[PDB]
Design a protein around this ligand. Sequence first.
Ligand code: NAD
Ligand code: NAD
Ligand code: NAD
Ligand code: NAD
Ligand code: NAD
Ligand code: NAD
Lengths: 167, 167, 167, 167, 167, 167
Amino acid sequence: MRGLLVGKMQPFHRGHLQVIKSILEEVDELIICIGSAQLSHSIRDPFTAGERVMMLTKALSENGIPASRYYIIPVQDIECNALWVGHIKMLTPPFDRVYSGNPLVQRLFSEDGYEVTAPPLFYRDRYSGTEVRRRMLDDGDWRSLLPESVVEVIDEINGVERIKHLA
Amino acid sequence: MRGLLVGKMQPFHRGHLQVIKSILEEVDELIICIGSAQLSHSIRDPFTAGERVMMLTKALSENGIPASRYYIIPVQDIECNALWVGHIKMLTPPFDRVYSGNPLVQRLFSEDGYEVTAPPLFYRDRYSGTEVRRRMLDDGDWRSLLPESVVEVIDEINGVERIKHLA
Amino acid sequence: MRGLLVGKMQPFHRGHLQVIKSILEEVDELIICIGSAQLSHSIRDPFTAGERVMMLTKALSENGIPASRYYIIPVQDIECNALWVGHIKMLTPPFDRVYSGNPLVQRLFSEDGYEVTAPPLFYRDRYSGTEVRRRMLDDGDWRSLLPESVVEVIDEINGVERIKHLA
Amino acid sequence: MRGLLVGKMQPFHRGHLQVIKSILEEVDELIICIGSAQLSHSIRDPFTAGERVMMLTKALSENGIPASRYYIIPVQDIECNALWVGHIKMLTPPFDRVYSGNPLVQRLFSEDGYEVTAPPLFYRDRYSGTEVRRRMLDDGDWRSLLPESVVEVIDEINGVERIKHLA
Amino acid sequence: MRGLLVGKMQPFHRGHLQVIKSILEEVDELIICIGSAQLSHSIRDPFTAGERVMMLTKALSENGIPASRYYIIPVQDIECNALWVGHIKMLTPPFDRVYSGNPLVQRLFSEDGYEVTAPPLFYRDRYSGTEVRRRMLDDGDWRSLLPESVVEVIDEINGVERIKHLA
Amino acid sequence: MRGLLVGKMQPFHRGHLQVIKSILEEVDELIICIGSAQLSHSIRDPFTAGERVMMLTKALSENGIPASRYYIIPVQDIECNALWVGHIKMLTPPFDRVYSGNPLVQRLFSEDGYEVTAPPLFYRDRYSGTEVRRRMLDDGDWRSLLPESVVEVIDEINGVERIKHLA
Ligand SMILES: NC(=O)c1ccc[n+]([C@@H]2O[C@H](COP(=O)([O-])OP(=O)(O)OC[C@H]3O[C@@H](n4cnc5c(N)ncnc54)[C@H](O)[C@@H]3O)[C@@H](O)[C@H]2O)c1
Ligand SMILES: NC(=O)c1ccc[n+]([C@@H]2O[C@H](COP(=O)([O-])OP(=O)(O)OC[C@H]3O[C@@H](n4cnc5c(N)ncnc54)[C@H](O)[C@@H]3O)[C@@H](O)[C@H]2O)c1
Ligand SMILES: NC(=O)c1ccc[n+]([C@@H]2O[C@H](COP(=O)([O-])OP(=O)(O)OC[C@H]3O[C@@H](n4cnc5c(N)ncnc54)[C@H](O)[C@@H]3O)[C@@H](O)[C@H]2O)c1
Ligand SMILES: NC(=O)c1ccc[n+]([C@@H]2O[C@H](COP(=O)([O-])OP(=O)(O)OC[C@H]3O[C@@H](n4cnc5c(N)ncnc54)[C@H](O)[C@@H]3O)[C@@H](O)[C@H]2O)c1
Ligand SMILES: NC(=O)c1ccc[n+]([C@@H]2O[C@H](COP(=O)([O-])OP(=O)(O)OC[C@H]3O[C@@H](n4cnc5c(N)ncnc54)[C@H](O)[C@@H]3O)[C@@H](O)[C@H]2O)c1
Ligand SMILES: NC(=O)c1ccc[n+]([C@@H]2O[C@H](COP(=O)([O-])OP(=O)(O)OC[C@H]3O[C@@H](n4cnc5c(N)ncnc54)[C@H](O)[C@@H]3O)[C@@H](O)[C@H]2O)c1
């Protein structure tokens, strides 16, 4: 039983970790696709796919989740939404269920015949990429929104200095 | 200490496994990029990136190599060789050394300032994607050239029927 | 005498039908290019090119316009506006006049040396893709804005459920 | 009942016409996709998609086949074969059966769950794009291989002068 | 000693000329990249790369700056910001310093290890592409913001008629 | 009076220099487009566009040709030959005549309505990119085929070591 979760992870936050843990209770393995893998250095998409791979890797490992239970696969975006589900299938192992709170992702997989689950949102008011990046820019408390390992990655790659300069 | 290995893995064979094991003796983790992730269903590139991810995953796991010791990242090809090293960096975790027997890959990383190691070839006369695919097409003994787990993947996805039809 | 009409047809409405009929009174055949053929599943561009081909086909046929009097050709968008006129020429039969109310389309063809006609707008306050899609989303009366055959196509492909989910 | 036929039509020849007529005896409408719509001015792909649209249109009309019985849709090629079937679906009306003698096309649609029919070849030794273009270049008898209407199109667009210059 | 300046030059204005002159006092040659070379015919990017090449050429020549002191190189934009610095390097001669007031350009080159200088802004309230284009559209005094040679180019290519039609 | 010359310049050789000098006797300025600006690090296309810009610049300057008499513009290739002439126009200043010995280039510009001149070939048996690169690889005398300034550029960028490694 393999599930699929897709997200920009800009950056990977506590909401992401929580949903992943719950998902791992109903599936044997979880395919985690880092979408928009081609975007980086913008206010909405500051981190490269590689930096995000490290964020995910450290965070999951830090939380004791065995690496054998998940796949981290960067996925560049494409121009045709009608071909995106096929695009994901082509780059990933086979999967039985799709977990997503993103309307577009839900509708695309739904139309393709996949069962789509929308997990309950975990503190959607604070655990969102938008809030995290807003706090980084306005000097708010973004650190509490992310697993400690992610904060370390961001510090190491000078993530805040980057996003502030770009803004 | 993290190394980087790039290959089409069309399909993943015993030569690949051997070089990976030796590399894992000098580095802590190995980033394994599956190149030409956009190509599939052709005589030279029959398998999708996703099918190759499964081949690698099963094979490495079958050989007792812990998943925490490697990263499997599909990498689509790009038009400009001059930007390829940057392309790889953008999609991967940081790495210290590059292992490759491919002249182009060696020269590109070399010009970029990376130390490149060309591991000794393991039975280059039989352990090559070209030979494997040739045997699949001419009904030769391709199975002995691949780890058992890879053969199982190919059987499951009807790899031989596909490549034969395409030829 | 062949004319050219380009439009997103998202979806094909009564305004489109009316302008086509009038155009067919001054030209022998009309080339109808469905622009942005690569876009689908978005609030501004909900339908695939194929679904739009059916909308046009059924509507024109429903209105007794012989198929021998027009060409339905999907045209993907391209990055360079400076090459778009050439892009259209490359995918279509030769044409003598261009009919369009779109400023960009008018200027591009004009600069290329083509005579461009801007037909009078037919109820521009209700007959527009924007209004149709707005009514579909807010449960307004979108059906009256489209030929009956188009409504049937939309019902069949669950167009409203799609656009509502995406919103 | 709608069928699908895909071909480069470089140029449209008597073999194409014959297979289309037979297909039209088992389906109500035939979707005819002109593949490699982006290629032109090369020895293997001399004609633009638009020129080919005219070739098909004139030929089918010349042979009394009603325009309401077919769709002529140019389809640009894409880099990922794994997404091509989806690419075709996205640009076309729905279809029940696929007719093709091309191994790749057959395997792709087959893997996607479509029934694929390989019509008998009509004089494959003379009725092929390769032979036609070879005769045009070596001053052989290419005219007898094409419907008269197609020859007229080629004469009008100076097709032979083009291909000879390119060679 | 060679410097690098990148800009859309939509259109080339007095601010551009001033910064170039000052830069030419600290470097032997200046590489001038016209960014977004693929965009044209839009309100934000009205002129083609070729038209901009003429604007730069005439203006610099008009101001007595020898052609041997600079390189005018059109550079199309790319999807990955992470590869852009590499993209520029690939299309240009080697350079020692980068001059730019654009935050993104500064951060990208900075992260790549280049020294980046942000020249003082020359009348930023009037000397900006945005103001120039705004005046062209609202019939303001755009001519005083540009070198005379640039105005002549714009008049010759009917730049104002174009941008007004597009708006 | 402005002419246009397009070439890969892989690398710029004595034949190129000779044709340019003769052309400069009938035109006031010469636009020199370095085609395939996106290709580098391959046996057929070893040098980046930037390296070629330097080769041209040094060679022309070395031969006393004033920089004000020419434009060096890198041009990436595109997928549609039917749009290439438009692609060139978009990136360059206006031109009156096209000089080329390349059949494709000649036919494309010819069909677009341009007068195309095919200058006499200068020692075509030795002055060709193919011969130069062949000698570099087989240790033949490639230096005599290129202007001295070009040899210096190649030495400086380790061009021979690169092409030999790639082979
Ligand atoms: N055509 C295309 O190229 C195309 C089409 C669709 C989607 N995409 C890609 O999909 C990606 C979008 O992913 P996204 O917007 O979902 O990214 P995201 O990082 O914001 O969200 C990832 C997922 O995590 C979960 N999640 C997020 N916050 C949560 C919280 N607080 N509590 C619980 N669960 C939470 C949701 O399932 C969500 O979908 C992008 O890369 C986009 O480009 C591409
Ligand atoms: N511009 C670009 O897009 C660009 C530039 C360079 C390379 N690439 C990509 O790089 C990939 C090519 O990888 P490849 O040709 O090396 O693939 P491969 O699967 O044939 O080889 C993978 C690697 O495995 C090792 N190996 C193979 N056989 C072995 C044996 N018998 N014994 C020991 N070691 C062995 C070598 O290090 C080799 O490089 C492609 O996807 C290519 O497109 C892309
Ligand atoms: N570079 C590029 O890729 C490029 C450049 C220009 C245009 N395009 C494409 O052109 C398409 C845009 O077409 P559009 O905006 O005109 O689509 P549309 O469907 O809104 O309008 C189609 C045409 O129908 C007519 N029309 C619409 N409503 C009417 C009414 N009520 N009464 C009478 N006539 C009416 C007008 O002539 C109009 O231009 C897009 O696909 C766009 O991407 C592409
Ligand atoms: N990834 C991709 O972009 C991708 C993948 C697959 C195919 N394609 C496209 O498919 C197209 C290829 O079409 P093709 O090679 O079949 O073109 P074609 O014109 O040679 O043949 C068209 C079809 O006509 C029929 N036919 C041809 N000669 C005949 C004869 N003498 N008698 C009877 N029937 C005959 C066959 O069914 C054949 O497949 C190309 O445009 C190719 O690029 C694209
Ligand atoms: N990924 C990518 O494709 C990518 C990433 C970064 C940048 N770019 C490209 O970079 C280009 C952007 O250039 P831009 O925004 O700087 O263009 P611009 O023409 O507005 O400015 C050009 C430069 O001129 C100088 N300048 C402008 N006005 C001045 C004034 N009044 N006084 C003094 N100096 C002045 C500044 O150094 C400025 O950066 C675009 O083509 C963009 O697409 C591309
Ligand atoms: N669709 C497209 O992207 C498309 C279409 C056509 C051409 N192109 C581009 O055009 C470029 C090809 O240029 P090319 O093949 O001519 O390059 P080249 O460097 O071999 O030749 C350049 C030109 O120099 C002249 N020349 C060469 N050797 C000479 C000699 N010994 N004596 C006298 N004159 C001599 C000829 O006019 C020749 O065309 C490529 O970059 C190609 O990709 C692109």
